[PDB]
Design a protein around this nucleic acid. Structure first.
Ligand code: 2KH
Ligand code: MG
Ligand code: MG
Ligand code: MG
Lengths: 745, 740, 482
RNA sequence: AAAAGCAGAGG
RNA sequence: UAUACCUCUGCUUCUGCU
RNA sequence: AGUAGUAACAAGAG
């Protein structure tokens, strides 16, 4: 008998057994190599869908920019980027007219948040294109290098600690003709490896001074570094993602904050809510949309997705939307909120790392960069890369490629949600006054669209009307990945509604494992993951008990901390058995110390050091929760082998070893400033205790804050009986000598 | 004493690079240079922990451990090695050093774990002394609500608790921020009294106070109790198909117990009005009911909560009534006049559509609580007079603001400035009166400026307040007089003995009608503590959707006997008490005409032979449980009230409420399956439909031989033998025949 | 934009646009849609990291030697119970590979197993082992600036995978994987005391689940893959240069309660200096087997099979003597594949959740726990297979083992073809579901949907089997309306 | 009715 | 020259290694 | 060779 699991769907409905259709127990698809081909394919598709637009050369950058807005109306069912701006403005105007007072309150919220916001809000990003280094750096170091290059020129407004002064300096920086940066460079030499007896190359990374020209800095400030996306499920082919830099992220933050304030107060946006709040909002607006319909009306639902969404939007459409939303607002508000579509319309896309080129008479491989792909003769590339370089060659501006149309992968998620919500809003029956009307939800590009009509032909006309109205604004519904059915069952952002949102346990299956922090945090994470999946994702009681057993097995085999009655032989077996045999109450030992599992379905919310506190030996809990714990960090005793505070952490809260080494690469030239910065933060925190708890606020230099703090604390210690007058004179003389060293260096 | 850190700073200021960083980087830019990295970062720490435990030393620790842990074990294992390049304050540590510290380390008699993690020990004490009841299996109906995972201080909000935490732990590090409340000052004094000479680090003290005082809320799918001691064990008490009875270890909170008392009493009253004897059903339901495993009839004896549904339960028991309610922190002792509630649609001042319940009728009030007192005459959407008194200047204005919001005119509703949402971020219906109250209690200028002025006769016993605040005895507001003594207290704490009758209307010993069952709010909120109506009049879990699914489940699983009652002697079938909590979701006007429509459909299905559809009996049978009317109309749906929103149940076919899937052969009610009727459906399902229209038989699809199409209410111009087409619903076109 | 007044612009450009821009709803009916187009070509090859249905274990019962737990000691104790070692002779050649290298690799392996004095075994860097592990098959990576004068510097080629054909062995592997055994392969850990009533109910249901799921053959493949990936990860990260020998060893308990150590073969680790997460550590797998490769040779394209022994095999009527082969091949893995292979035990979480929901969805309707009626009243409720008679229905334990084996093979045969196929065929399953709900479904481009589904069915045996399964389910749905 | 980091998922 | 943006959920409060 | 799959690993920047 040939076994077929999908015949299970002959009895169980597909949404009830949907977790079988998610093969999420194997490895996800990774890429191997460069994302240069995916970047080239994104650029080629982006200029393919907008090819009938206006070609014009930018006077500042020189890039061949393509202008598809107000272009010819589409003639086929393909992707099209030709968006009509009067249609976009009519949609934003009708969105305002249906929701009165919304735009003014959102704009006033954003005006009040503009003056509050500091520069460090930009340090909450992951990996940023450092235009100073032409690489990816973390966003804090990218902002730090940007602010250092800015203040090394005559651009010091960001010293006032506000985001908007940094944005004033950003827009003023394009006027500088000869912006000067500090870059990295390697010094290679050949030395012999000793453990393998091979001659290899030793790269030492250093610093270097180089000056950018005006047009080169304008290219690097508009550059979106492109990489390939790893571990994406559900796709056969890979795709490219892009990261912008510090010149653009502040403006995109303010535009997305304004659009977030808009999207929070729209019934038809799935953003920014998420999880159970999203499911509650979706079921409530489904109930409201089915309350708006009558008995005679049909009701269908489009389980929709839009094809090639981010390359078929436009920054010019977003400029029109920003200027129509902020109508009646101040002019500095309109200019500051309109910077970001202008920075996205003149943008430029760095291709990748290049390609690997293979020789056979020399038996060699090498990496020729993406900025060197225009030097190689075309007979060396394979046919697809040859076609891509032929289709892309006229767009190259200093290794990057001109990319005037399209968003390039999701930097305007809420503004795109507003643009889709306007087309959802146009289908009101008092606006349309037709034989059909529609309403729906929209996250960014996904939409559920409930269309009502008196007959099925009116549903067809409503589908056509919605599809053409989306075509007029640059939104192309995927005819492959979308489908329609009667209302009561749909899918929206992998939430499978079947008269109510069913669960999907498999999607949260990669959370079920040992997290890998230390022995205590992993135990809390594993028990809490089982707990929250029992709460939210309909994990059964028996399966949760089996998940406790599987996590205890994985935890013991990971940390080599099996019990004392087991005979497995690890590095820790003799020490754990010595702790096991000498302990009277073995039920109070932690799982990381050979103890038994205390956990069942009722005590998942109680930590393990708490669940076993009554069963511990007094010597064992005096050793485990010892105040002078050497595995954790101790504070220093402030102004109340020096004095420390007592550590409340256990011995299983240790720090795992980190490795930052790069193969054959010495990095003592660029890892030094990080060490000096951490030394400066550590000497600051001895004067200000709360700086670890809540990040401090100020505009004066750290030396002046620390010297004023030392002076006033010496005076309060003098006039409260906690210091002598000789100590007070010593501290004030020291602060005066430091003040003599802050100027007379 | 503070002399070592200044010498550290003088040593770090002589290095010129460090001096440049200390002099050029401000305190706001030190947030940026704190997260500055340069080297390669490592993804996927799970796999790195999977392989790094194979190494001898996967743990890094401070260099002091060279003096607190020996280099070798008894068994010869090396416990640590120094790192290669010297100068670093780190060494590499084996996990055998951890096990050696746990078996032969120094033993300290003081441990800060039970104090810092007091919350988890309180959860453990709640679980250990917790009682477990049986496990029941039925269809859960969970609602994703915002609940407290941390209850916080009752006197503090999260912002005020963070103010208190920054005042207790870091008193020199608050900025230009002062404490506002007396609660914040008292909790700061108490927490400074406890945490003085504390050896715990200030950050750990801050997080201990943060898990004590700060309220945290999450959106969770809740069935039943939403208190913070029933949400902590939410994985244990509820599942997808089962309910685990549980009572924690301790006392129930009073501010939770009063609320679930109100909700329990509202459900008992609203179920009681539908019954044959509302008084006997209320007395049968009130004794078996237990809130948090404590009986209801002995909580009502001692609870001082005064509310129009709690009072009917108390007047049926024999407990003295304080005939009042609460609104905005003030008790409203209504003296004269009886109003009645009606749902209306009100356009607001922010052009916002809003649907409320306004009370039509004349009333007179005696408002008073905790700082002030006022006597109020008020009709339908009108604030006549308000002789407001009190004990300060601000408190009489606060009571004036509260009474102007309570008036519910057309003037305060068109006086809103700014935004005021009446749905939440998850589009859940916020209460409109408290929304307007919290609006007009912070920004109150445009209400007073639109309130205007009125000329009053300058006689004593009445003063006046201007629309700014300067007291004049000639010009006042439009109703706002200042009482020079207020109203007399010591008669608002006085409780009243009361009579009650069969239909739950409360009278005093004089005879003035205090409470009616119509005054009881038909708001469906869910409780903080679990309520167990141990009755044959209420299902297991209450709420509207649970009533729907439990009623349809009971009809489906008893269909073999209910079908036999339907076929012969049906007048005993409709009056069954299991259909009686279903009627609480139909609004009161439609119940008689829905039952008349349903009984006419069932009689036509009996008389027209062969037209049997059991799904059409199951779907409409809980609507026939009301003494009908005779009004010959034509319904295309039956509207029910669920969570403050209507839901339409179509007479023909499937809907969002009641679907019948031929795939699973299962009837789905509100996303939950309630079973197959008897798997006896193949003998049914003919062509002609009988229980859709009142007097007409559906004969297949439409026809062009029989004239143009119609709508539902265009059939009175038809005769016995005239056949026509009807656009019945859901895009269908059917042929329609009249009977003789 | 500040002074824009809408003058009916959208209706104007709706009239001005062409009527070749539309979304025509075409009605969906599964009695009219075609089946998925499986590719054509050569048959599909086994690509797993170990033999599944054909592997043979030398087993010892209740080990009590000097190294009861140490890997190579248990390997030596299991090899000592086989005395049929004859000379190695190749009986099935690897076509693209030097087969005498595989012969000399097994000879060097067995001889160093003989002279093994220690707990570990590192093989010697010989020429045939350096071929079988690929030491030297990389071109030396240079910097472009130092090799600007190379004439033959062409590129790396980016051919797609070649379209293979559905061979019948992968259905046989899934058949043998969903069957019970005479052992217990998962040996769980302890819980706390079941104090709450729901913990008694959960423990009763978990005992049923453990009885049905610990003796399945997919649990044996779970333990083999978890052990192999664990030992390979530890050896790859701690023995980077050395050619470490890793024996495939699992530990089971029989249903009579006695322990057993099974040896399935050996894995010679290669050089492993992995820096990425997709960098491939090469190894050589040598697994004992009894199945002749010359009967289903298309399955064994990458294998060199050399007959290495004899064993007296007992049978149901009498007792015979069979030869013993050794499937040798070069294989490779990465840190991501070893990471996701060490975590194969969550396949138990993927199946046992679903079956539990199948009980719970009944338990809410029956107003009772339906665990014991599902596991004892064997009424054959769920359809899980296709026989020549009709469609075969199994019980909830059979469904539990089938869903276990499906998750296990999703983890063994993980590929981007599987991800794309499942994501694109989920939509077709939802359209068929919407049809069976009488919810009147309809697409706009069904040809593009079929083209996107069939784009992923290329060469993977599991994905080809899943497409065949989809076609069988579609034919069952079409027969259900007859 | 009333701070940041890491991990996982989704888009 | 290499893991983007946004959102939700969960945990933790980190001192910095050829 | 093998892993693999639109470009790589098969040690010498992750
Ligand atoms: O990882 C992600 C996924 C999605 N997105 C954003 O979400 C949008 C829709 O995500 P998508 O998955 O639909 N991809 P799309 O670009 O529409 O092409 P297609 O597969 O043909 O539908 C994308 O266009 C991005 O803007 C991201 O930014 N990052
Ligand atoms: Mg898309
Ligand atoms: Mg979608
Ligand atoms: Mg999408």
């Amino acid at each position: 008998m040939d076994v077929n699991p999908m015949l299970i769907f002959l009895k169980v409905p597909v949404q009830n057994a949907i977790s079988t259709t998610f093969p999420y127990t194997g490895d996800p698809p990774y890429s191997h190599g460069t994302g240069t081909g995916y970047t080239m394919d994104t650029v080629i598709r982006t200029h393919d869908y907008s090819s009938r637009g206006i070609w014009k050369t930018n006077s500042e950058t020189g890039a061949q920019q393509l202008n598809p807005i107000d272009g010819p109306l589409p003639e086929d069912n393909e992707p099209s980027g030709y968006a009509q701006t009067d249609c976009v403005l009519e949609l934003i105007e009708g969105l305002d007219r249906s929701h009165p007072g919304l735009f003014e309150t959102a704009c006033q919220e954003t005006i009040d948040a503009i003056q509050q916001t500091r520069v460090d809000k930009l340090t909450q990003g992951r990996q940023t294109y450092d235009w100073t280094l032409n690489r990816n750096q973390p966003a804090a170091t990218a902002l730090a290098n940007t602010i250092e290059v800015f203040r090394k020129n005559g651009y010091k407004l960001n010293e006032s600690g506000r985001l908007i002064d940094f944005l004033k300096d950003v827009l003023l920086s394009f006027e500088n003709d000869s912006m000067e940066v500090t870059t990295h460079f390697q010094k290679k030499k050949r030395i012999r490896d000793n453990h393998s007896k091979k001659m290899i190359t030793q790269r030492t990374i250093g610093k270097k001074r180089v000056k950018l020209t005006k047009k080169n800095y304008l290219i690097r400030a508009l550059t979106l570094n492109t990489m390939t996306k790893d571990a994406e499920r559900g796709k056969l082919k890979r795709r490219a993602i892009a990261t912008p830099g510090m010149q653009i992220r502040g403006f995109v933050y303010f535009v997305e904050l304004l659009a977030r304030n808009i999207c929070e107060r729209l019934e038809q946006s799935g953003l920014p809510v998420g999880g159970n709040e999203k499911k509650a909002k979706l079921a409530n607006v489904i109930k409201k949309m089915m309350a708006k319909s009558t008995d005679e009306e049909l009701s269908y639902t489009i389980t929709g997705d839009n094809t090639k969404w981010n390359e078929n939007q436009n920054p010019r459409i977003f400029l029109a939307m920003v200027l129509r939303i902020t109508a009646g607002q101040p002019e500095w508000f309109r200019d500051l909120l309109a910077v970001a579509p202008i920075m996205f319309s003149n943008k430029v896309a760095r291709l990748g790392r290049g390609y690997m080129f293979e020789s056979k008479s020399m038996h060699l491989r090498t990496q020729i960069s993406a900025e060197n792909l225009s030097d190689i003769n075309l007979r060396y590339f394979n046919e697809d890369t040859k076609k891509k370089i032929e289709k892309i060659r006229h767009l190259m501006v200093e290794g990057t490629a001109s990319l005037s149309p399209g968003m390039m992968m999701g930097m305007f998620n809420m503004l795109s949600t507003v643009l889709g919500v306007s087309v959802l809003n146009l289908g009101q029956r008092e606006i349309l006054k037709r034989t059909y009307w529609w309403d729906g939800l929209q996250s960014s590009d996904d939409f559920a669209l409930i269309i009502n009509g008196h007959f099925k032909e009116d549903i067809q006309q409503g589908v056509n009307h919605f599809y053409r109205t989306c075509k007029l604004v640059g939104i192309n519904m995927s005819q492959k990945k979308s489908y329609i059915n009667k209302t009561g069952t749909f899918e929206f952002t992998s939430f499978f509604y079947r008269y109510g949102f069913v669960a999907n346990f498999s999607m949260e299956l990669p959370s079920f494992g040992v997290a890998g922090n230390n022995e205590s945090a992993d135990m809390s994470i594993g028990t809490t993951v089982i707990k929250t999946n029992m709460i939210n994702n309909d994990l059964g009681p028996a399966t949760a008990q089996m998940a406790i057993q599987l996590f205890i097995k994985d935890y013991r085999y990971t940390y080599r901390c099996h019990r004392g009655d087991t005979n497995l032989e690890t590095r820790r077996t003799k020490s754990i058995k010595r702790l096991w045999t000498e302990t009277i109450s073995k039920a109070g030992l932690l799982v990381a110390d050979g103890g038994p599992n205390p956990y069942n379905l009722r005590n998942l919310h109680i930590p393990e050091v708490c669940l076993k506190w009554s069963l511990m030996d007094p010597d064992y809990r005096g050793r485990l929760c010892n105040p002078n714990n050497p595995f954790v960090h101790h504070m220093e005793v402030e102004s109340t082998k020096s004095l420390e505070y007592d550590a409340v952490a256990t011995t299983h809260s240790w720090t795992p070893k980190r490795n930052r080494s790069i193969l054959n690469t010495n990095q003592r030239g660029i890892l030094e400033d990080e060490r000096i910065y951490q030394k400066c933060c550590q000497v600051f925190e001895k004067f200000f205790p709360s700086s670890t708890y809540r990040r401090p606020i100020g505009m004066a230099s750290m030396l002046d804050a620390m010297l004023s703090r030392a002076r006033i604390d010496a005076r309060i210690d003098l006039e409260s009986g906690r210091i002598s007058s000789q100590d007070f004179s010593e501290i004030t003389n020291t602060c005066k000598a430091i003040e003599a060293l802050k100027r007379q260096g | 004493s503070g002399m070592e850190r200044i010498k550290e700073l003088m040593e770090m200021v002589k290095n010129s690079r460090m001096r440049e960083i200390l002099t050029t980087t401000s305190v706001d830019h030190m947030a940026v240079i704190k997260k500055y990295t340069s080297g390669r970062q490592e993804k996927n720490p799970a796999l790195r922990m999977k392989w790094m435990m194979a190494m001898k030393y996967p743990i890094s620790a401070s260099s002091r451990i060279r003096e607190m842990i020996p280099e070798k074990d008894e068994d010869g294992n090396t416990l640590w090695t120094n790192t290669k390049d010297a100068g670093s304050n780190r060494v590499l540590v084996s996990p055998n050093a951890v096990t050696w510290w746990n078996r032969a380390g120094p033993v300290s008699d003081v441990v800060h774990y039970p104090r810092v993690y007091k919350m988890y020990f309180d959860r453990l004490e709640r679980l250990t002394h917790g009682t477990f009841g049986p496990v029941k299996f039925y269809n859960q109906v969970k609602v994703r609500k915002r609940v407290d995972i941390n209850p916080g201080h009752k006197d503090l909000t999260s912002r005020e608790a963070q103010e208190v935490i920054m005042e207790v732990v870091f008193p020199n590090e608050v900025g230009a921020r002062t404490l506002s409340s007396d609660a914040q000052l008292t909790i700061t004094k108490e927490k400074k009294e406890e945490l003085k000479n504390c050896k715990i680090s200030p950050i750990m003290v801050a997080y201990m106070l943060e898990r004590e005082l700060v309220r945290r809320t999450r959106f969770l799918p809740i069935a039943g109790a939403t208190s913070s001691t029933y949400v902590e064990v939410l994985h244990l008490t509820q599942g997808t198909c089962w309910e685990q009875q549980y009572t924690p270890g301790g006392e129930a909170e009073n501010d939770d117990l009063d609320q679930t008392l109100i909700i329990a009493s509202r459900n008992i009253v609203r179920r009681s009005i539908v019954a044959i004897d509302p008084l006997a059903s209320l007395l049968s339901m009130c004794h078996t009911t237990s809130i948090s495993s404590e009986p209801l009839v002995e909580i009502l004896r001692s609870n001082p909560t005064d509310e129009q549904a709690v009072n009917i339960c108390k007047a049926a028991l024999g407990i003295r009534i304080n005939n009042s309610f609460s609104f905005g922190g003030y008790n409203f002792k209504r003296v004269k006049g009886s109003s009645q509630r009606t749902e209306k649609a009100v356009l607001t001042g922010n052009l916002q559509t809003l649907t409320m319940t306004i009370f039509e009728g004349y009333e007179e009030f005696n408002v008073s609580g905790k700082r002030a007192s006022a006597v109020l005459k008020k009709g339908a959407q009108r604030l006549i007079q308000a002789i407001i008194g009190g004990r300060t200047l601000e408190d009489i204005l606060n009571l004036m603001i509260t009474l102007m919001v309570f008036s519910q005119e057309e003037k305060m509703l068109k006086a809103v400035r700014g935004d005021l949402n009446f749905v939440n971020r998850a589009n859940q219906r916020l209460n409109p009166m408290y929304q307007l109250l919290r609006h007009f209690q912070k920004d109150s200028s445009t209400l007073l400026k639109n309130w205007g002025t009125e000329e009053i006769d300058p006689i004593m016993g009445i003063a006046g307040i201007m629309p700014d605040g300067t007291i004049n005895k000639t010009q006042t507001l439009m109703g706002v007089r200042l009482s020079q003594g207020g109203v007399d207290e010591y008669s608002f704490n006085e409780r009243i003995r009361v009579n009650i009758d069969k239909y739950l209307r409360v009278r005093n010993e004089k005879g003035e009608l205090l409470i009616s069952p119509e005054e009881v709010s038909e708001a469906q909120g869910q409780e903080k503590l679990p309520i167990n109506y141990n009755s044959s009049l209420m299902w297991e879990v209450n709420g509207p959707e649970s009533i729907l699914t439990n009623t349809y489940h009971w009809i489906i699983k008893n269909w073999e006997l209910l079908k036999t009652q339907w076929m012969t002697d049906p007048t005993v079938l409709y009056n069954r008490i299991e259909f009686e909590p279903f009627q609480t979701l139909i609004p009161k006007g439609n119940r008689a005409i829905y039952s008349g429509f349903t009984r006419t459909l069932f009689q036509q299905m009996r008389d027209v032979e062969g037209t049997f559809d059991s799904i059409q009996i199951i779907k409409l049978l809980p609507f026939s449980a009301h003494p009908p009317s005779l009004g010959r109309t034509q319904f295309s749906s039956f509207t029910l009230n669920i969570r403050g929103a209507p839901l339409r149940l179509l007479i023909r076919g499937n809907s969002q409420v009641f679907n019948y899937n031929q795939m699973e052969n299962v009837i789905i009610v509100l996303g939950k399956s309630v079973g197959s009727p008897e798997r006896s459906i193949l003998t049914e399902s003919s062509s002609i439909e009988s229980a859709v229209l009142r007097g007409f038989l559906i004969l297949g699809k439409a026809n062009s031989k029989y004239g143009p199409v119609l709508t539902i209410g265009e059939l009175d111009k038809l005769g016995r033998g005239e056949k026509a087409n009807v656009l019945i619903g859901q895009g269908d076109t059917v042929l329609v025949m009249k009977r003789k | 934009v500040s002074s824009f007044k809408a003058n009916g612009n959208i209706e104007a450009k709706l009239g001005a646009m062409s009527e070749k821009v539309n979304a025509q709803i075409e009605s969906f009916d599964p009695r009219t849609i075609r089946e998925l187009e499986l590719p054509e070509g050569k048959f599909c090859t086994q690509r797993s990291k170990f033999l599944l249905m054909d592997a043979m274990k030398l087993s010892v019962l209740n080990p009590a030697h000097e190294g009861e737990g140490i890997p190579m000691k248990d390997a030596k104790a299991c090899l000592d119970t086989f005395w049929g070692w004859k000379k190695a002779t190749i009986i099935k050649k690897h076509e693209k590979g030097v087969n005498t290298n595989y012969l000399m690799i097994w000879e060097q392996l067995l001889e160093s197993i003989k002279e093994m004095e220690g707990k570990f075994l590192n093989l010697k860097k010989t020429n045939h082992l350096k071929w079988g592990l690929g030491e030297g098959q990389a071109p030396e990576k240079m910097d472009f600036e130092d090799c600007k004068e190379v004439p033959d510097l062409f590129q790396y080629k980016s051919e797609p995978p070649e379209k293979r054909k559905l061979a019948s062995w992968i259905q046989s592997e899934f058949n043998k994987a969903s069957e019970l055994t005479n052992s217990n392969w998962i040996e769980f850990d302890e819980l706390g005391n079941d104090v709450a009533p729901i913990e008694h109910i959960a423990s009763r249901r978990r005992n049923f689940f453990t009885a049905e799921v610990s003796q399945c053959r997919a649990s044996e493949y779970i333990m083999k893959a978890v052990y192999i990936n664990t030992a390979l990860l530890n050896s790859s990260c701690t023995a980077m240069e050395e050619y470490q020998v890793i024996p495939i060893i699992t530990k089971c308990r029989d249903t009579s309660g006695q322990r057993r150590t099974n040896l399935y073969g050996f894995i010679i680790k290669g050089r492993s200096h992995l820096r990425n997460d997709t960098d491939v550590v090469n190894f050589i797998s040598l697994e004992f087997s009894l199945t002749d490769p010359r009967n289903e040779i298309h399955k064994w394209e990458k294998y060199c099979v050399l007959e290495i022994g004899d064993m007296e095999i007992r049978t149901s009527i009498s007792t015979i003597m069979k030869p013993v082969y050794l499937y040798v091949r070069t294989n490779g893995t990465s840190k991501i594949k070893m990471k996701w292979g060490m975590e194969m035990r969550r396949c138990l979480l993927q199946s046992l959740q679903q079956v539990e929901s199948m009980i719970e969805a009944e338990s809410a309707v029956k107003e009772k726990d339906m665990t014991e009626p599902f596991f004892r009243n064997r009424e054959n409720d769920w359809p899980i297979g296709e026989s020549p008679q009709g469609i075969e229905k199994g019980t909830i334990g059979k469904v539990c083992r089938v869903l276990l084996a499906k998750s296990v093979f999703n983890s063994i045969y993980a590929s981007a073809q599987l991800e794309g196929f499942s994501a694109e065929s989920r939509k077709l399953l939802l359209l068929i579901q919407a049809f069976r709900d009488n919810l009147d479904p309809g697409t706009f481009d069904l040809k593009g949907l079929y083209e996107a589904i069939e784009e992923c069915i290329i060469n993977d045996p599991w994905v080809l089997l899943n497409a065949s399964w989809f076609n069988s389910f579609l034919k069952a749905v079409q027969l259900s309306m007859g």
